[PDB]
Write a protein that binds this ligand. Structure first.
Ligand SMILES: Nc1nc2c(c(=O)[nH]1)N1CN(c3ccc(C(=O)N[C@@H](CCC(=O)O)C(=O)O)cc3)C[C@H]1CN2
Ligand SMILES: Nc1nc2c(c(=O)[nH]1)N1CN(c3ccc(C(=O)N[C@@H](CCC(=O)O)C(=O)O)cc3)C[C@H]1CN2
Ligand SMILES: Cc1cn([C@H]2C[C@H](O)[C@H](COP(=O)(O)O)O2)c(=O)[nH]c1=O
Ligand SMILES: Cc1cn([C@H]2C[C@H](O)[C@H](COP(=O)(O)O)O2)c(=O)[nH]c1=O
Lengths: 264, 264
């Protein structure tokens, strides 16, 4: 996609060399923003083939509050295997914080149900927020949350969302992250009877791994194709009742996929 | 400042009318970003006179972990009076979360001391984050945190910071918020022996209150003046040991101040 290739180029031209947690080395910029008008099409990268199966199942997994990789294996998704312990556990990452954030006084807060209540009763609210950054549980998580903090906004009958992503693997992670949140905006809007508006992506440390350089040059030589359309076939009774079958991505005709190593 | 007046104009030209919590009514956009290179000067608005006394004391107050307004009154600062209860308490807002975030299992996490440790031992870390958005305590806070989430970044010997502000009163709040965080970046960099880099401001619901319209037009008629310089006179032994006296703002020569009502 145009916005995506522009970011890749900017990281190449303006990025500084930086060591990192994984010992791989990166080219990094700090602070970037881009916007996708979801009415123009579903923002799924076309300059390389993206595995939709993994994207959709990861989101449905977050929404059930699961942090164990069994559900992903049941469905042949292996994107979280490198960080799981011997029992398949990741600790209280994304899904746990979204569905059951533990309080000091012994309760669990379901942020997703709260957001639903806000959007149906107080759509003008400026506090429609989900956070995965639970400071008290960071030390139990296999990875600190990357897509950490997100806000909904309603104007003129349209639902928008902004994600703050503190750390962004531009090649491997970002195409999944944009599609994942775009899907959520479509699900939320369907459940609340709203039209879709904008997805606004904001990044902190936004980087290319040094062993993604050839794959990056290859992809930048290719021309984006038209964006596909997302069709949701059914209105489930709740946001927690979607199924893989319910989604159709029509007119997705990407360039071939490019393999690259994940930095562990 | 140029970036600031450009935002004001954009909200006037592109903002949509929106009701709000306070019943005042706003013009609102969603999602905006701007960047201040702190080496070019201290980003204190010059098209209206800003009360530096209130800005500096509010920051020193956050840093001591205080959520009671007594310290502010001691120092003739009254910017938080409308939301305090009969004993001067705001609940566990900003300062409490920064200095003593309560965990489910009974501990308190001092995020500021953690950040200091990270910047001195793991400056390349992509997890150098402070959050005020403690989901488990939101219902005890007089106001949900506006400047909610911030990240530090080190590159090439320079310290940068990005703030996510979910809700931004463009006229009254933003000039204080930009100066407040810029000050913190200068304090942090001094304590860590780094040069200052960029302050990156990101906003969610970014708005003009409807009863700030005349004051907004007045300010947009004025030409920005040169940015002042910030001098820190002393290196205290720690980030918690700064005093009002320690800061000099040299060459600040603003246009007159513009009064406007605060929406409660
Ligand atoms: N350095 C780094 N670590 C990470 C992630 C990341 O993006 N970067 N993550 C984002 N998430 C993943 C995990 C794997 C793939 C991945 O390998 N995708 C490949 C293979 C696709 C497939 O196997 O189905 C690709 O698009 O070509 C895509 C997304 C999970 C999470 C795990 N930790
Ligand atoms: N709607 C709304 N509610 C708010 C804030 C806000 O910005 N907007 N807040 C940001 N913080 C304040 C509070 C008051 C002033 C203020 O009135 N400043 C005025 C008067 C200055 C002074 O009295 O010293 C000005 O710059 O002209 C400036 C910043 C605290 C917090 C309280 N709640
Ligand atoms: C889980 C996840 C990780 N990442 C990345 C960004 C970094 O490269 C990161 C983990 O390293 P970090 O915790 O040291 O930042 O993996 C994403 O880009 N998207 C994701 O969804
Ligand atoms: C405390 C604070 C509030 N505000 C604002 C933005 C909104 O106008 C807000 C409170 O309303 P909200 O919680 O309904 O968003 O006051 C700032 O802009 N900066 C600040 O530092």
């Amino acid at each position: 996609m145009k916005q995506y290739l522009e970011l890749m180029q900017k990281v190449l031209d303006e990025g500084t060399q930086k060591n990192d947690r994984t010992g791989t080395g990166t080219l990094s910029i700090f602070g970037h923003q881009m916007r996708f008008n979801l009415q123009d099409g579903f923002p799924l990268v076309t300059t390389k083939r993206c595995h939709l199966r993994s994207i959709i199942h990861e989101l449905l997994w977050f929404l059930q509050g699961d942090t164990n990789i069994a559900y992903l294996h049941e469905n042949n998704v292996t994107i979280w295997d490198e960080w799981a312990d011997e029992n398949g556990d990741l600790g209280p990452v994304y899904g746990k914080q979204w569905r059951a954030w533990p309080t000091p006084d012994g309760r669990h807060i379901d942020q997703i149900t709260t957001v639903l209540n806000q959007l149906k009763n107080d759509p003008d609210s400026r506090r429609i927020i989900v956070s995965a950054w639970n400071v008290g549980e960071l030390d139990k998580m296999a990875l600190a949350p990357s897509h950490a903090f997100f806000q909904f906004y309603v104007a003129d009958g349209k639902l928008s969302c902004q994600l703050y992503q503190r750390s962004c693997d531009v090649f491997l992670g970002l195409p999944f992250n944009i599609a994942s949140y775009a899907l959520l905006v479509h699900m939320m809007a369907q459940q609340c009877d709203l039209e879709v508006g904008d997805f606004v992506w904001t990044g902190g440390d936004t980087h290319l791994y040094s062993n993604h350089m050839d794959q990056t040059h290859l992809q930048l030589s290719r021309e984006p194709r038209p964006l596909p359309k997302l069709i949701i076939k059914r209105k489930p009774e709740s946001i927690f009742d979607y199924r893989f079958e319910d989604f159709e991505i029509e007119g997705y005709d990407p360039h071939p996929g490019i393999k690259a190593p994940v930095a562990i």
